[model samples]
Target: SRKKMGLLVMAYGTPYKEEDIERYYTHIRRGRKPEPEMLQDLKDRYEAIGGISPLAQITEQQAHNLEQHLNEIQDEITFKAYIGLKHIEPFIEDAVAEMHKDGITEAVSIVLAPHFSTFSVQSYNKRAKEEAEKLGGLTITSVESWYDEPKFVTYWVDRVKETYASMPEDERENAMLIVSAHSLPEKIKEFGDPYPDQLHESAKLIAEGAGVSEYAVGWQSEGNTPDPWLGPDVQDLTRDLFEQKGYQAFVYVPVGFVADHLEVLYDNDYECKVVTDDIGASYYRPEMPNAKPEFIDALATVVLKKLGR
Candidate 1:
């Protein structure tokens, strides 16, 4: 068998048990929090799912799907995909070790996140480089970001169109469109992080492509810190639409998140739903494209093109 370069897809890991919750949250805290009870609610949420995140499994599916598609185009380029999580079992070090074991001397590490910032994508690429050095001979070519890939643009546009088309006729026309994205600390904006701008630009392009005339950009997933993060908040945006603009129906489009996970499940779905209910407004959240075949195909095409397959 000809040895081929490996593809590593890294993501933020989730805990698999109630007992593991505090550990996971603590890793997120990076030595800041002082109590498990402070993170207990999140533990309970994991407990509801039997203490496991379905993300790793879904990521595996996505990787395998990508490999299959790529193989069809060029079978000689041995492509094996691996999943690496920041704070979990399949850590960056371990994934690199496995790639070495599989005789992969080169790699192209990619983050599952579409929108990238210095703190996010750079951190991931840094880890990959560090891990590659441990193996001595391995060369890593990490994909920094693909915010404006045509395939990705089509994926979001198609999803929004399908979601809006499924709504009731009366609800579709006047429904306030809220494009919710994950927020970062205020300090990054001062440092000239291209994240917010890229997100807004992506939202604008996708909405325009989908023929969506009514839409607004909002932020979500703020840290526990008291400092001002990004805004206007998703809830605030929703409220303004209903209260100030007299909008009745809503489409909660999570353009930042591509899969159904914590941010989407808890923040956008649960928390946002409460606000919509309070305002007596109808609401709908579009499904995340987790392992969606078409979206996976689009991603594979990007990888192939990037790698010169």
Candidate 2:
């Protein structure tokens, strides 16, 4: 019997329009409606970043590219790719239903995130599994994380080198590189979550590969929850770099993200840019690996490995 495989790519989805923002944000909050002030703040952030995130579109392109790549290399099995969002349209359950409708008995799930955490990657996998179970007998294989993959490290190394080369000679020598990722609550440590450690490892590898010795690891895009979240925040780190360490320029390495969305565009580009300007330091962020052919290749390689190719 021939085999059919579903390549389900999962991501944190974003709204495509201003009106959808409330619904989307509520979904992220797990149906707890956002407070007016918080909702307004989110609206402002989205407005600053152009009122919509390109995450869904980019993930779609990635799915299409992965499908083509998989089909190109193997003929014995057929592969079809689908995009599933954790909190928005085309939710994980819906994507699985489509796969089941298309007669996919076995599927491989890959989250776009590199690092795995019980609160993040595992949550997505659990959701996918729950949905698959509802349909009965759907075998779901998950690619949990690929933060330290050689090709993944290589891509960041190249990006770091390219961005570093673009700086002035003096700035290049004196500039500090700050690697950052989305901040999770400090309590995640109690759960034995390896997220923070994995992020730091990835940063360390990229910095070493780029021959960058003057670097620091920080967290960004923290939630507004009253409870304590991860730190030292990237903003604080930037201030310390200029005031305490006397660094005049910095390169922002978004080691956790694969594409440009609100966090990358507004949180890092606009918000952090403000901080850097206030500190009298130049800020530089390397381009995200969105739809880049090499990145697509890396994703394909991971998927193929998961498929036992």
Candidate 3:
């Protein structure tokens, strides 16, 4: 018997303003108290990015793009798509309920995040599975991760290469590749989380794909938590690279991120860019791979491969 299929896209949600920060943080923390300073920092970043992340819109666009691409590749099959944010309205549970209402009996739940972390992808998968079980109709097939896929590799490589190509020929000589990603607590590594390893490999593969011989990976968007998330933070790294290493230009490739979310729009574009400017260095970030043709195709390939198409 044939199964009716659907696609579920998931992401970390962001608040639209300083006022929403408390509510958003409360929702995200699930009744726990987020550090005041951390919340404030988040509010600042949100403000810096014009008080909103393009992530929700971008996720929907990706879903729509994926629907089109899937339709082009596969014969008439149900492929209802829904976007679920972890900590906001239109949350995972609601999205799953909508899928149930739509009579979607089989689903491919894909986290928009490229790299995997137990705390990141697993949390989304757990929520989806829990909700689907309650709905008791859908068989969920959650994509674990796609960090090292050839298509993903190609997408990052193409975007990074194009970014470098856009600069003046002479400037390219002093340009350095920097792949930044959201940092998790270092303690998570003690639990054998594969995030650092996966991100490392993803960076190397992307650099190889982009024909870049010089590249470095650094953690970004380190939360304001005093306990310490990942290390070699992006700001510090930028100063070290430009000031100590004497690199003239920083070409940023957010390898762990797929779209222009708060992390890229605020953390990289505003905060990190400020550091670059202050250090008297040129900073350029490759556009996020939201609906980039190569990225979409790569993701489609992953979908087909997963579905045995």
Candidate 4:
């Protein structure tokens, strides 16, 4: 009999519905319930973006697609993919529990984020490891990072070119490309975090591959903490490009994200767009990898390579 291999896909979870908002938000804050004002703010954000974050759905689809792709390409092994959320229901520990229940002896965990950070991807990996430890028999191998994988890079390159080609010719050349990712606290540098550097390396490779000569890297969706976070922020960078650098149009490539979530839809499409509109500059963001065939193939390739298949 063939042994079952599980693939655990991890991501920041979202509320399943408006009713789940409070619980979801509290979970994110590590069981500390949010103040009414903070809770309302989050509700308002979700309301502005159609009352829900599509991250959970999109991540599930990615896992499904990956499972199918792996099975189709490799007959030597069979896969069962599970979706795990960092802070919400179907948490990483719960997913590992399910894998154990299903009799999975070995598995690989991959966070949806491409760029690795001690504060993010490593945390997810740690949770999975802890849970697997509880199960005793399961061995979980985590994929640390895939930011520079050729397939990953090529997908963004094609996306950038496609988006650039869609713009008006007169505005295309002057449209500055801004690659972005979620920001972390400045303190991460003290621990020698490679997140920012990896993000830049990925952005540089994509820009070069896309033949984009004018591109900049920025951070976005920073937490509302008192401590300073990464910068120059996407909004600030866009403003500078429009006001100082004389860029009249811009294309935003969220290199660190693999799927469309609140960050991409609300932060980049809504909040950042407002900033660009205020500055009289057009804002365009390429479609996210989301469950695109190429993205699934790329993910499958990574999993296969990790498994030595």
Candidate 5:
């Protein structure tokens, strides 16, 4: 048997059915049982999106496509992509164990999130390492961040231009371009985390590549916690621009997320859109690049480079 190099693709997972909502939410909430109302609210969100978010499905496709993509490009070490979710099934630890069982002694992992942070991607690396320790003899190298990967940046550039075309032509020159990422707590500043700065850098690169001038790095999907989260919240920015500054057209690039899961679907599409609609302004965001050829290429490139191609 030709031993394969495991391409462990990690992502923030979601439940695939209504029945799984409780445990899913419980897992997210760190083993605490959600209140009946809390659980029901999650169920409602899932039902609104037809009983499941497409994250699980999309991640699987991304893994499948990435495996095929890697094999097509290189013959030295065949890559076998494994889908590992942070919150739900095929958890990180399990994915690593499976990698060992499949005779993959050396593995390279990349979290689907483009940016890295101690509060986020670090935990994934930690978990994978812990599992590899127990499995013994398996060595895993994680691509902690790919926010600035060239192909990744290019993908966003193309997406920005693609999404920009949908906006009203007259407003294109001055449209409020808001590129956003999921907000983490302000405490990350103490750790001197590069999350916020990297987010801004990606926006700047995208704006330049797409040939746009004005842009803002906004934050979205703040956790429901007492601690302060990162902002200028995208919704708040949208409102302020429309009311205080009379900015009429908005173009949003959700730079933090790779696929259209609940964050993109419910948070951005449903919630953020409401803010723009309420202010009587047009809002446009490019389609999510789930398993898109360009995105797959981006992931493949990052993995290849990380493995010293």
Candidate 6:
């Protein structure tokens, strides 16, 4: 009969099937319908990468592992974990509503993304709070950022070093470590979002921990909007490093994202690798912190600190 605290983890969700992509896309567009060509293009991307993205499933596993981690590390209070998707089923509002229905008065929410952006994590918590208003009286605190979570940074440091070691000696010697994340719209700067800065700082920390003297940052996966999104996409940077700088090797990190999805599997492993191959450059990507025990441990530490444990 210990106290129970609700823990909600949120992320960008993917459609479960081709049939749901239109609905998912519409939701992402805030109910504006997509162009036929644009719609087909999205469908093709999903198809090209194996029908449906594993993002939703991987997110579920992350929550499952996180819940287990919390329970194992804490006993004064029981942590009841729930997951919500921003763009698909079991929305953030739904998770909040369920926590209210379950009568959990104390709660906390953390996004899957580490860097806080008014355009991203903050907006997610905002929606969850909006839902809380309707259901009434669920006080959910936010974990604003875990960008410098110690174990989290250490995890990547080890990964970068190990990934770098796996490369051919010639490639390893010349490889420029590149840390990256999903691009935000340029509009994020209007709000003075710390996203880009946070991403850079995390890269610096990782580079230092991995003992690399130099590195670069690349933005990835811009939207199709006429308005500009973030710049110097990952593949384009690879092309430039090879063509302009004559760089022959790279170790890429997607620091913004947590797991394998379209952005990682397709954008990095498939598409960006294509460009790297075209340039005959060696490329490597450190493992993402997806359901790894060490990653779950890092998250548990962050949650404990947020709850004043």
Q: Say which candidate scores most in lDDT.
A: 4
How far off is residue 306 in model 2, in Å?
1.9
- Better model by lDDT, 5 or 6? 6
Q: RMSD to the native, candidate 2?
A: 1.7
> Model 3 over residues 67-174: C-alpha lDDT tens digits?
788767778565778888887778988999999998888888888888889888998999999999988978788888898779788777887888888888766888
lDDT of 2 by residue, 1-309 (tens): 447889899998878777788898787777788889988888888777765756567777878888887788777667889888887889889999999898889999899989998888999999999989999878799999998888888989999999888888888888999998889989899999999999899989999999999899999989767889999888888987788878878899888888888889988899889999988888899888888888888888888887778
What is candidate 4's lDDT per residue for 239-281, written digit by digit as tens? Answer: 8877777877889999898877888989999988998889877
TM-score of 1: 0.92
lDDT of 1 by residue, 86-139 (tens): 876788788888888888888887788778788788888898888889777888
TM-score of each: 0.92, 0.95, 0.90, 0.96, 0.95, 0.95
lDDT of each: 0.79, 0.86, 0.81, 0.88, 0.85, 0.87
TM-score comparison, 2 vs 3, better candidate: 2
Worst 10 residues of 6 by lDDT: 47-56
Candidate 2: residue 173 lDDT (0-100): 85
Query: Per-residue CA lDDT of candidate 6, range 94-175, in tens?
Result: 8988888888898889999999999889889899888887888778898999989999999999999898778787777778
Model 3 / residue 275 / CA error / Å: 1.6
- State the local distance difference test value for candidate 2: 0.86
User: How well is each residue in 1-309 modelled by candidate 5, as lDDT tens digits?
Assistant: 345788888888888877888888788778888999988887787666555846578888999999998898887888888778888888888888888898889999999899989988999998898899888999889998998998889888988887777667777765888999999999999999999999999999999999998788899988777889999888888887777777777888898988777887788787878998898778788877799989999899899899888
Candidate 6, TM-score vs. the true structure?
Answer: 0.95
Q: Rank the candidates by lDDT, best first.
A: 4, 6, 2, 5, 3, 1
Give the distance in Å from residue 277's predicted Cα in candidate 5 to where it truly belongs: 0.9
Give the deviation of candidate 5 from the true structure as CA RMSD. 1.6
- What value does the lDDT take at residue 253 in candidate 2? 84
Model 4 whole-model lDDT (C-alpha atoms): 0.88
